[PDB]
Design a protein around this ligand. Structure first.
Ligand SMILES: *[C@@H]1O[C@H](CO)[C@@H](O[C@@H]2O[C@H](CO)[C@@H](O)[C@H](O)[C@H]2NC(C)=O)[C@H](O)[C@H]1NC(C)=O
Ligand SMILES: *[C@@H]1O[C@H](CO)[C@@H](O)[C@H](O)[C@H]1NC(C)=O
Ligand SMILES: *[C@@H]1O[C@H](CO)[C@@H](O)[C@H](O)[C@H]1NC(C)=O
Ligand SMILES: *[C@@H]1O[C@H](CO)[C@@H](O)[C@H](O)[C@H]1NC(C)=O
Ligand SMILES: *[C@@H]1O[C@H](CO)[C@@H](O)[C@H](O)[C@H]1NC(C)=O
Ligand SMILES: *[C@@H]1O[C@H](CO)[C@@H](O)[C@H](O)[C@H]1NC(C)=O
Ligand SMILES: *[C@@H]1O[C@H](CO)[C@@H](O)[C@H](O)[C@H]1NC(C)=O
Ligand SMILES: *[C@@H]1O[C@H](CO)[C@@H](O)[C@H](O)[C@H]1NC(C)=O
Lengths: 360, 101, 256, 50
């Protein structure tokens, strides 16, 4: 096939390339530490009113979306602009967590394009909102038999709220023509009304805690990236290695090289990687690429015989009538201690001939 | 639609005892804020079964107009509220319904 | 509480072969590696500043250019950090690095910095460093890099969103403050800041008198400026940079 | 709402391949067992054309 002929003259012909196929994939990504504080936001003992909704910025951590999935009470986990399945891989620059408490009937209002008291006067999302909304029942934490009068909402406002805007003003709403002068009464109402939560209310009126996660990308490098799985480490085999975003394929043998504490990789004279430090355990490994060889076929003429021998150039015999030569591993020829003239050259003083195929 | 969970939790469908005294009149209560209860000292009779259907018809009528404003949460006139319970009392008393259940 | 207390004088000295740092985190052993980066040129003009407080505003804000080489022979308690930014007021973001006896706090906020900022000990207060700090977007607390005759060298770079700090502590036998020989600066921290930095200022510590409200003090430090230069670094058997040639200094080094 | 798209699928399609299978997708660790619910959504959603 290589010579494009049906008759092969006597000699050695380089026909293919032997390779050691990768067996496993080892993705030793950076050690998972300093997870994003979702326990502080979701599991807080005290939430905020919807008029003074709490906003927490999230940056420089690993965003873990598995804790959220684990929690069973969630009534809505509706996501907008990104899929829930690909939350852990696609990553963003800043994450805003907005926390508040509303009544169940208004949970549908926390979405782009919706109208109501909460959307117009308390919390507005833009029409191009990229993020998720999470809501869950909070009867055991926010309902009191006497009535919980610590949750408030804005019922009256002159104009609608802009997206991601808060209003903590306590000015009396002037609905008529006469000035209010700071005193309530007729045509002058206090805008903030209390959410008097009680445990015996209907499902549309029980307290629901809502956390809105808004993801934004800016010109800055994105640093809230979800943790990448770090599989176990396998040594002494040809494994596809992914160490801290540096990819390749090679054996990882033990190393005698003493790295300085600030160094992570290692390079050859010719600027090719020869070493690496594992980011889970501070140890040094000698990256050595998997064995490759020039498969050469040693044959006499097809007029004489169809027997062949295979020389793997540069490959030790343990990594592939098997004889080890300095040229490589020769399979299919029998070493003879007799010396003859060279018929088919193998290399390093070794020659092959047909008498079976012998190497000498 | 079926009954709420708070209806099953908060209604007292059995006479509590001698120590605690309660009014034995069958009454359907719309407490507001999605809270619906039935005050009924049930006895094991057909009459209490029909009365339970009547009061649950009252509760369903109260349940349906929960989306309305508070001052409009009533029957359109005084006859409708009892009529929608009496039709359930009519339907439940038929021999076909008793053979069905 | 911004008060003008520090006066500053300046002289000019030679850099010799100081200021070399590790340009990456790659181990190289027994090789000669040529890299083009922001380096302090060999035998360059370095300004020696003496800042004296005795018990008017004479401590101006220095430019940052493409990065700053800082050196000091003083003890770890006198110089306590630095200030980085452009306008050094509330309209732009700024970076404040403050060291104390236990840790270092690196923090990026909208500081309204004082004209003559200094950390005063009494506990330590930053009310003489800035008057307000709003819209704060970064905070990083870690182990300090001013610890304990000992020459302390730092390299600050602001490259493509990251503020890189390189440091080294070298025991210098009593003599000339800027010694001969090589001492490469190890990479200390890479901070994902992403702000514009054109000016910088050094923070000093002043002690209350308890008897001319602050005790008189002096601080000497060397400032040099990095330039885009090609260097040839020698990596020995153990991966340490033990020598370098500045490719554009003289024809002999260019041949090397 | 007559036009629907496949929001969720286990794997990407091949060129010139049509998928009309109205089977449920498992978006989480928990199996869905063919019934909709929490974190179990239908793959085909309709466009709101107005
Ligand atoms: C050195 O600086 C650190 C960093 O600010 C100080 O430690 C903080 O002290 C405050 C007290 O107001 C605590 O609220 C913080 O939790 C501490 N932070 C850390 C990381 O420990 C420390 O007190 C300073 N030491 C001196 C002597 O001034
Ligand atoms: C909240 O507390 C529960 C307690 O079991 C825990 O499992 C969970 O991880 C915590 N955090 C969140 C975000 O739910
Ligand atoms: C890396 O992960 C291991 C997991 O056991 C943990 O013990 C270790 O503290 C982490 N950090 C370092 C620097 O090794
Ligand atoms: C009412 O019916 C719905 C489904 O139709 C069911 O999910 C709910 O549990 C039922 N409620 C009660 C109290 O049986
Ligand atoms: C350093 O700069 C000053 C003025 O900026 C100049 O007078 C002096 O000669 C310079 N020194 C050297 C060695 O170039
Ligand atoms: C900075 O702060 C001022 C008031 O403190 C505020 O009006 C402005 O919007 C803030 N900007 C940012 C980017 O946070
Ligand atoms: C950084 O600030 C300087 C001085 O204020 C200005 O000239 C320069 O354009 C700024 N750089 C950017 C990228 O905005
Ligand atoms: C390098 O490391 C070896 C082994 O720790 C040590 O003996 C030697 O002194 C070090 N330095 C040099 C320049 O070889």
């Amino acid at each position: 096939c290589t010579l494009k002929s049906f008759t092969v003259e006597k000699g050695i012909y380089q026909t293919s390339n032997f390779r050691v196929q990768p067996t496993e994939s080892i993705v030793r990504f950076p050690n998972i530490t300093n997870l994003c504080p979702f326990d502080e936001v979701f599991n807080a003992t005290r939430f905020a009113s919807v008029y003074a909704w709490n906003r927490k910025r999230i940056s420089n951590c690993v965003a873990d979306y598995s804790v959220l999935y684990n929690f069973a009470p969630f009534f809505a986990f509706k996501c907008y602009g990104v899929s829930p399945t690909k939350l852990n891989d696609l990553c963003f620059t800043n994450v805003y967590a907005d926390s508040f408490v509303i009544r169940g009937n208004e949970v549908s209002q926390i979405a782009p394009g919706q109208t109501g008291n909460i959307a117009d006067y308390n919390y507005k999302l833009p029409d191009d909102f990229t993020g998720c909304v999470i809501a869950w029942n909070s009867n055991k934490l926010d309902s009191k038999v006497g009535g919980n009068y610590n949750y408030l909402y804005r019922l009256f406002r002159k104009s609608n709220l802009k997206p991601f805007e808060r209003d903590i003003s306590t000015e009396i709403y002037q609905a008529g023509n006469k000035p209010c002068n700071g005193v309530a009464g007729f045509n002058c109402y206090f805008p903030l009304r209390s959410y008097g939560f009680r445990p015996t209310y209907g499902v549309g009126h029980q307290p629901y805690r809502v956390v809105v996660l808004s993801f934004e990308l800016l010109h800055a490098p994105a640093t809230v990236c979800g943790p990448k799985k770090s599989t176990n480490l396998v040594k002494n085999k040809c494994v596809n290695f992914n160490f801290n975003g540096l990819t390749g394929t090679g054996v990882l043998t033990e190393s005698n090289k003493k790295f300085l504490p600030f160094q992570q990789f290692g390079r050859d004279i010719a600027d090719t990687t020869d070493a690496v430090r594992d980011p889970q355990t501070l140890e040094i490994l000698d990256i050595t690429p998997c064995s490759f060889g020039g498969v050469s076929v040693i044959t006499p003429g097809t007029n004489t015989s169809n027997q062949v021998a295979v020389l793997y150039q540069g490959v030790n015999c343990t990594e592939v009538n098997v004889f080890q030569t300095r040229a490589g591993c020769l399979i299919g020829a029998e070493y003879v201690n007799n010396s003859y003239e060279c018929d088919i050259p193998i290399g390093a003083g070794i020659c092959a001939s047909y008498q079976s195929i012998i190497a000498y | 639609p079926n009954m709420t969970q708070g209806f099953w939790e908060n209604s007292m469908l059995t006479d509590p005892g001698n120590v605690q005294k309660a009014v034995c009149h069958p009454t359907a209560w719309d407490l507001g804020k999605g809270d619906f209860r039935i005050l009924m000292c049930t006895k094991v009779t057909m009459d209490d079964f029909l009365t339970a259907h009547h009061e649950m018809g009252h509760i369903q009528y109260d349940m349906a107009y929960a989306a309305q404003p508070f001052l409009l949460r009533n029957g359109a006139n005084e006859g409708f509220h009892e009529a929608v319970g009496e039709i359930m009392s009519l339907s439940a008393a038929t021999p076909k319904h008793l053979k069905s259940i | 509480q911004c008060v003008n207390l520090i006066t500053r004088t300046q002289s000019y000295t030679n850099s010799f072969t100081r200021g070399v740092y590790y340009p990456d985190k790659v181990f190289r052993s027994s090789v000669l590696h040529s890299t083009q980066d922001l380096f302090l040129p060999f035998f360059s003009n370095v300004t020696w500043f003496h800042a004296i407080h005795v018990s008017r505003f004479d401590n101006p804000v220095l430019p940052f250019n493409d990065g700053v080489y800082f050196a000091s022979t003083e003890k770890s308690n006198i110089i306590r950090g630095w200030i980085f930014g452009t306008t050094l007021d509330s309209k732009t973001q700024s970076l404040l690095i403050v060291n104390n006896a236990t840790n270092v706090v690196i923090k990026v906020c909208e500081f309204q910095f004082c004209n003559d900022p200094f950390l005063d000990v009494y506990m330590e207060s930053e009310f003489r460093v800035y008057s307000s700090a709003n819209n704060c977007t970064f905070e990083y607390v870690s182990q300090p890099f001013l610890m304990d005759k000992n020459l302390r060298e730092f390299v600050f770079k602001n490259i493509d969103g990251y503020f890189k700090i390189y440091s080294k502590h070298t025991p210098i036998n009593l003599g000339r403050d800027l010694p001969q020989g090589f001492s490469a600066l190890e990479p200390l921290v890479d901070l994902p800041i992403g702000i514009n930095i054109t000016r910088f200022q050094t923070l000093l510590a002043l002690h209350r008198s308890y008897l001319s409200g602050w005790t008189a003090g002096a601080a000497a430090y060397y400032v040099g400026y990095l330039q885009p230069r090609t260097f040839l670094l020698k990596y020995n058997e153990n991966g340490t940079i033990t020598d370098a040639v500045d490719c554009a200094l003289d024809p002999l080094s260019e041949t090397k």
